Symmetry: D2
């Protein structure tokens, strides 16, 4: 309430701090939105974001590590100037890679903005405290290459998440939801090797790798009837031959599989493997099945963090109702990944979403959800009961 | 020529003997044609043919063994009443099984007739000899179940062909040819076993044996592009499920494969096996691949017997241009299997061929080809140079 | 409460009446369970149920019409002996057809029991009223052939539902739910006509109707990737040829399609039709696509009836969380179709569910849900606000 | 015989003239073989061959038209310096385009050589005549782009063949045959157009053009069972999608069809068209079926020219036993297209055939067949009975 320095006042201060930074946060958005960059090539975005935190006053009060483990990833940290337990480490993630051809059709410029905004708001609320604040470290991580590769996984492998206690990010969508079901994903490239022959003269001396590709497609297609409705299989024939006068000796398929858990994903992947090896057996070709570098995990929900986020969203006026490398993060750190409406009916990964992601209209919705994240971070800092419940829900759901 | 008892006179006598028997030979044809019987059920045909040879005058001069190794097979033998090398054993085959639904749509009634006629003609020509005839045994074998099962193979397994020196038969067709390419054949029944489930509720708990059948079909179909043009693959889905509400747990396919040699047939069969096992692997079903009881061999040509037959056919006015268990015979005894026109344009295995096979018109053509066979048998008896050349061509072509 | 003759007392009386009838209700269950009968052949079940209502005391107080529009359907009615608006007509449905081979693996014996029990309970509660009861007619309809054919649709076509105001039934399942999503369904038989030919000699003169069946299967299979996850396609190749020596001239497929609305079902059906006609075009065959006699509709929910049912279920101790011809009923009369747990983990349409459906354990759960239905019927009788809300929700959801 | 200037002496003189030119003919071969060029890009070959005929002594005695209708085609003519019926026009064809990657793997350098050699030999035999020679025009046509495009067809369209009476060429192969069955050919490019959608979110909003490609492949594959054994279908999936996250909206197939006559080719092409349009219908895509620029015709045999060629080949020591745009020529001018062994077991269109085509060993065989062609041209010049029989066989076989 209106008490000396209540939690409510700290939440208000975080909101006022985000409002105060609205103009430079929107410039941050537009600098990324207007210069879209693909996975692992976000050199401009990396420049913009590192400069953003280096310039936050007082300059150098954010400790900024550019080129953190990846050339376009960065890390930025702030903690109250204090000294003598263990400090609470709260992480905020920024995404900023675009999509080929259509630009920021997933609003990743606003994910960068919302992670920066929420971290500014937590710092400003903690600087507004008179008595020494509890020991907290605000950590911002720039995570490149969400659409391809999975920069958070590169960062997990580097140990970047091993000391975080809770991690926050949010994603622009078509409605406001504290959690939506993101699924595990496994990528594969399938290559078939046969034996060239002149189809005009001696076709029976060939081993037809195009046949292998089509049979694999047929094999997977009838299998769809026995997939679970939550399972997904999608793929293309990237190479299906070069000229009709030669029985093709090479073919190449590229496929994705998705399922709501890793146990199901491995069942689905094994059935697909059988389908690919069947096509080799039937055609007389050999086959190479090369899995992707980084399987994406499903996102593990956190009930306690979920409820505390929705309560803050309600106060802010928020009404509530694929796959991401945030799933891998959520398996090693309790986290939340809310989706938020930005005033558009367009769907993600379409050109009209690129328009909405860059719009002035989206800015209000983006800063509002950033306020919700910061208030929730303040919840975790000042409610030890919540932190333990968060940890309890994290340990329990990990039993899977 | 007009010499004492030249070979030419003996050939004339065999022709006159067949002409003399034309009425009872045609009654033999009509008795089988008018009462068609299927493989291994030719009880009436077996009765007709055994009675035919028992009644040839003088009665019992043909030594007749009814129910010879098979209930509807028979054996009939005649040799000149003589005594003291090795006698020449010349075999003549009678077929007499019909086709389901359409009756004697392959003219098998005329194969019975032509084998009987040729054997009568050889005996009559040898009885016309004054001086003691060379030692010869005329052997007639009734071989049931040509269209299904392969009665000649049952008879080979019983040893019926191990003492024959040359074997003759002929087959009504659409033109006169001393030899046509009959191919090796392998039959298979394929059964897939999956796991039933309610497709309405839990289809993903099923293993779909109908899928296996369709994938095998697809696998074989793309393979056609790499078959040799002489290869043949034909098959049906005999069982493809029972009701749509249950994921089928059983499916059944029936296939035939044909190739011009046993070496090629085994290559084709192995590629098909891969196709069937691929469908099991892709679908999660198990599979049973049960080969037929009797593979049919291709028919081995005999150049020497071929040329001597055509020379006799020319003198008679004959102008010259699938798979059968005669192929298996031709691998163990030098033989010929000429095809003969019967005055019809109809194709074998059609209803109009049943009409032609029963027609009065066909009788002239049938007796004419029987004359050609008997004259050729007389060639082998009285030309030791031909017998050795026949044996030479048989040993040489067996190198395969 | 404990008031003169409150609604609560009437609900208690309906429960006590069902308890009083428990022994004869269970005998009714066992008489159907132990003599399973298939769609339109439920002659014993029809005898059992008509006799049940004719024997309810005082005898003939239920007005019973055997052989009502269908040989095994029946209608039974009771109303308070009263006289001088419009009477409320409340319908209760009894199902009683079994499944081939496995008997009452859907618990339809308990659907018969629960519809009878609920109607007895409403009558007993209304006979317990001192002052004249409001004008109500309790209607029981025996609806045969739910698993195949759709007896409720036969009955709709006869006008049986045109004067009902609300209709009640319940279905044994694996949990207690006031509503579960039953989908629209369309059945089709597909027949392909080609041209026979001897595959041994002239396969190129055939038009292969087995090919048509396999291509249709392939066409539908790749289409699965673009179906909605709620859509269902299931089918078998009932006839796929007869013998491999003849290019098949006939093939036959049987398929079901399901979608959550009639608009979606027609989209799905049209895409399938394209798949079937494509297979004819590719193969050179003609095709006949014969839709089923009775499309099943999805079940239209009724929010008001839903909430009033759950409130009664809670008081009774009930804890809450395919396609049926009840969907067609729910499009013409406001209705509910709750599912209820019967003390088993077995799934419907399995043999172990037949065991549970016949068990003594199931009887407690069956009578409890019948109590819930009767109390809800009493809700509609004595709450005009509920009746209008029920009608409002019915008109609104019909806008689809 | 040894008569004044018999035909035999003229044939000998043509052989001696070819022997005299062997060194420069082999240089001609090596100049093309060592600098392989593809269809319509044979600028060096065109330079070599035009220069060859311009340099034949006396210089300019061959009337040479470079860049004749096509940039790399040429025409060269010689006739006896004479004057006052109609002159006999005899054509000789030179091919000279190579194959991508493997060079002159069809020996086209030797087709150029053999057509040049035969024309030199006819001229030299006619210059050796004392009395005025009959009026003859020796025409050499360079026909580019045999492997792709069909330069003879470009030349037919320009009228180049309308005044020729007989046309000669020969093709290096694996044995010596006066005629081998070259088939009619039709090329098609098939493009499918669907509707992109995000397969991750809304795959059911896509229309899958990759599905169309696979279904067309399936459609054609089952059709193989009903093709004639002489028919050929071969094709590739040139474009089968770009990335798995987007339902492909475009696919592209490239196919060839071959049959022994134009009537059969059109039947085969129509059945394939049905297969392509079926895939569009099943998938919801539209389709464009674009036939090739130039259908190749089968080669029409000429019995009279055939027999006269073989008789000359025998005297020379020659022992006798796909598709080409020479087929289109043979439909408008009586011609022959013998194949000749060149001392190699390698197959055409393989790298080892490129070795043989360039070998010193091949030169003897090439000049020998050129001698046979020239002698046959002398046959036509000096046997009016042969010319009429040639024309008779040409008119008769055109009835097709
Ligand atoms: Zn995205
Ligand atoms: Zn995203
Ligand atoms: Zn037959
Ligand atoms: Zn036969
Ligand atoms: Zn049921
Ligand atoms: Zn049911
Ligand atoms: Zn070539
Ligand atoms: Zn060539």
């Amino acid at each position: 309430l209106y008490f000396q320095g209540s939690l409510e006042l700290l939440k208000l201060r975080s909101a006022e701090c985000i409002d105060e930074a609205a103009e430079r946060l929107g410039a941050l958005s537009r600098a990324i939105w207007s210069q879209p960059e693909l996975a692992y090539e976000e050199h401009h975005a990396h420049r913009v974001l590192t400069h953003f935190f280096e310039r936050e006053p007082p300059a150098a009060s954010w400790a900024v590590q550019p080129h953190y483990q990846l050339p376009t990833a960065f890390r930025a940290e702030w903690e109250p100037p204090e000294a003598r337990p263990r400090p609470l480490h709260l992480g905020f993630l920024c995404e900023y890679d675009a999509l080929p051809g259509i630009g920021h059709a997933c609003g990743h410029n606003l994910i960068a903005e919302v992670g920066a905004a929420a971290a500014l708001g937590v710092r400003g609320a903690l600087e507004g405290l008179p008595r020494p604040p509890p020991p907290v470290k605000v950590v911002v991580l720039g995570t490149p290459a969400e659409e391809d590769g999975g920069g958070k996984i590169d960062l997990i492998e580097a140990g970047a998440f091993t000391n975080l206690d809770v991690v926050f990010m949010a994603h622009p969508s078509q409605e406001n939801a504290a959690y939506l079901p993101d699924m595990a994903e496994h990528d594969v490239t399938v290559k078939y090797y046969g034996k060239a022959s002149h189809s005009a003269s001696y076709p029976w001396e060939g081993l037809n790798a195009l046949d292998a590709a089509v049979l694999a497609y047929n094999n997977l297609s009838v299998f769809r009837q026995q997939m679970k409705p939550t399972w997904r299989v999608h793929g293309i024939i990237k190479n299906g031959g070069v000229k009709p006068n030669i029985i093709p000796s090479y073919s190449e398929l590229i496929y994705y599989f998705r399922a709501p858990s890793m146990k199901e994903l491995q069942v689905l992947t094994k059935k697909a493997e059988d389908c690919f090896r069947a096509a080799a057996l039937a055609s007389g070709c050999t086959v190479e099945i090369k899995g992707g570098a980084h399987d994406y995990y499903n996102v593990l929900p956190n009930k306690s963090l979920w409820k505390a986020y929705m309560e803050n969203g309600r106060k802010l006026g928020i009404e509530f109702i694929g796959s991401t490398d945030f799933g891998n993060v959520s398996f090693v750190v309790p986290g939340i990944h809310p989706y938020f409406h930005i005033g558009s009916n367009a769907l993600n990964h379409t050109e009209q979403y690129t328009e909405a992601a860059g719009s002035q209209e989206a800015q209000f919705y983006t800063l509002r959800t950033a306020k919700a994240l910061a208030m929730t971070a303040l919840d975790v800092i000042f409610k030890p009961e919540l932190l333990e419940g968060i940890r309890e829900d994290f340990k329990l759901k990990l039993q899977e």
